[PDB]
Design a binder for these strands. Structure first.
Ligand SMILES: [Zn+2]
Ligand SMILES: [Zn+2]
Ligand SMILES: [Zn+2]
Ligand SMILES: [Zn+2]
Lengths: 72, 72
DNA sequence: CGCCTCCGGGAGAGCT
DNA sequence: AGCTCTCCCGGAGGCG
């Protein structure tokens, strides 16, 4: 039921991991677009439905840590 | 709204032709399967929802004649 | 960003 | 086994 990256309600198993719609699309864009992000805090930011936009850096890291792979 | 091959409820436009979902996957498998297929009747089998299973030979023939190709 | 639609295709459950 | 067919998830394209 819950997204392993932000804990919004999960919409399926995406790129390997139980994930919400928005994190699926975010991850795809993050890898393909080869953006390189930057944490403005400690790399410890809180990623939930309310704060996930704030730190793409930590959100992307949480994505990686959950095991998201573009070709799972 | 009706599959151009078996007249079941069409699920959209697959490989060029308005078809149902089972005709989509059947055609793909037949083409790539490099398949013999011999009709047990006289190449005039009735292909509908309840009968499309019996004769791959006619189903495939009907698929091709409907314009299904693995390009579009 | 977060969401939509559309169609391709993997997979696995279930015949046969 | 081989075949059928639905469920689920992929990319592309587009949108506010
Ligand atoms: Zn999420
Ligand atoms: Zn951060
Ligand atoms: Zn059909
Ligand atoms: Zn036949």
């Amino acid at each position: 039921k819950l997204c392993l990256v932000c804990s919004d309600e999960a919409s399926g198993c995406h790129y390997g991991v139980l994930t919400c719609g928005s994190c699926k699309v975010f991850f795809k864009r993050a890898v393909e677009g080869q953006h390189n992000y930057l944490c403005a805090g400690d790399n410890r930011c809180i990623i939930d439905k309310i704060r996930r936009k704030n730190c793409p850096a930590c959100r992307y890291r949480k994505c990686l840590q959950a095991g998201m792979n573009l070709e799972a």
